[PDB]
């Protein structure tokens, strides 16, 4: 082909990834539906904070996708103890994530797999949403989705309660979890099961009531829990300023409709207050 | 969205003459390939067009009785795949019978209409050996179809724009009391528009609006004010003129469309079968 | 070095679509099906479907190849 392998990068359930000349190649059913999903969605999206699909090719039913080559991801930076995540760095990461997400939501697509390893950084410090193998368009009334989407640690309570129809709240809740992981340097809600995930959610954030989630009980896999008081957000995030706590609260609102959208998050005072986001070129490099 | 889509960028063409140019290049290129490999057996471009119309109709018939029911978006996507494929390919190199099924297969995957291969080929009216052979052929041609579509898989159809226009008419254009009365006839026109090259020549919104306005005109209703007032086209008269011309051109394409004739289809099918048996 | 929000600037080549939160006040939502309590609990509102349909109706209506 027109690409030559340089080094091996990683291996997944759906594919293997290798560096090439510089790009990253992700090498009776026919062509794999996850690869086709990535192709069909990324061909229609062009934004600085969304992974760029440059080429696709293969033979028979085996297909390879070509992407821009990224250096790291948010999981690596979070897990790196030799990197201090200053408030400016956190704001910059959140800003790029939210700008890519605002673009994606405007084109009626949900990522549905948001987590630190799916937020890739290039050498210039540009964050890009990646791994669109679970992404799906939203807004149609007659389409039904599955509630198993998103990694469990970053799954929204509406998903954990069995919501088939949902909106941008799934991505925004995952964004709140990513923000909390950035602040604490550990997964915010590390559940071992769906039941344990919901238990950790309600133990940390308080058990939601019918007032803060009016149709909570109508979700399929809804079950009554103990009425946990939760922990004050300033107790969880002792170094969070009031604006950042407001952003976190908006992202962690139980009601998905009331949960802030990407545009509303971008308009919040947290992003306009001092300090400004770190320029991508100065973001930490592990 | 359509306004920044690959359909608008790469698959909406400026004229029927450009489409004829592409198809003629395809036919001539196949003729040159065959001559280099080894003559009345060849098909003329208008005969290729007749066969492509016939097999697009066959693709519609396949999708209509497909179980589980295909969403209209999937059918429109598959038909658009078929049209795009035979813009740059000859029916004597890739048989339209297999290409149309591969179009349906890829469309079902792309539009998230999750079906297993066994039920897909079980929709085919064939023996189990014939169904397995067809599955083998479809899997052989899936990557080819994707390559020829240049990996542009999302197809913006006129149906959702049609819905949005109906919502807008119900909300903002009370001079039309019940816009739903326009649906069925407009639906018919949409189908009739789909058989032409309009899906390669105009935007889905223009096609949807043309269908609605043709339905209104056949109903005895002129919604000139919907364009001028509600669409706010009274600010720039040029835009109103261009939209009116686009709709007129679409109506012209529909009136000038001719379905394939039975005898011509029989003769051309015999020629196509000769083309694929020989060489 | 302070961030400031500006709306995404993407030309639609068609008529202006009313803002999502305006739809209910403008009477559009009377013509789309109401979201069920299950849908609302999941965060799906009929405003989403209506807004998408209007956006698709207006996208590229004025555009010419
Ligand atoms: C868009 C996609 C195909 C892409 C683009 N670049 N890229 C890289 N680049 C190198 C790298 C990135 C991020 C972290 C470390 C190394 C790796 C990869 N998969 C391997 C992940 C293993 C490491 C995970 C640790 N959390 N996929 C990609």
Author numbering:
A (entry chain J): 10 to 30, 37 to 42, 52 to 310
B (entry chain I): 1 to 38, 44 to 284
C (entry chain H): 244 to 308
Quoted passage from the original study:
The bound ICEC-series compounds exploit hydrogen bonding interactions with the backbone amide and carbonyl of CDK7 residue M94 in the hinge region that are shared between all compounds, leading to a relatively well-preserved positioning of the pyrazolopyrimidine core within the CDK7 active site. Further interactions shared among the analyzed pyrazolopyrimidines are formed by the aliphatic substituent (ethyl for R3 = H in dinaciclib and isopropyl for R3 = CH3 in all other inhibitors) that protrudes into a hydrophobic cavity within the CDK7 active site formed by A39, I75, L144, A154, and the gatekeeper residue F91. The R1 substituent is the structurally most diverse among the inhibitors tested and engages in a variety of interactions that are specific to each inhibitor. For example, the protonated primary amine in BS-181 forms a salt bridge with CDK7 residue D97, while the trihydroxybutyl substituent in BS-194 engages in a hydrogen bonding network that involves bound water molecules in the CDK7 active site cavity as well as CDK7 residues E62 and D155. Interestingly, BS-194 is strongly selective for CDK2 over CDK7, while the related derivative BS-181, which is selective for CDK7 over CDK2, exhibits a ring-up conformation bound to CDK7. These observations support our hypothesis that this conformational change is due to properties of the respective CDK active sites, and that the ability of an inhibitor to accommodate this change may be connected to target preference, providing a possible secondary mechanism of the CDK7 selectivity of ICEC0942, in addition to the interactions formed by the hydroxypiperidine group (see above).
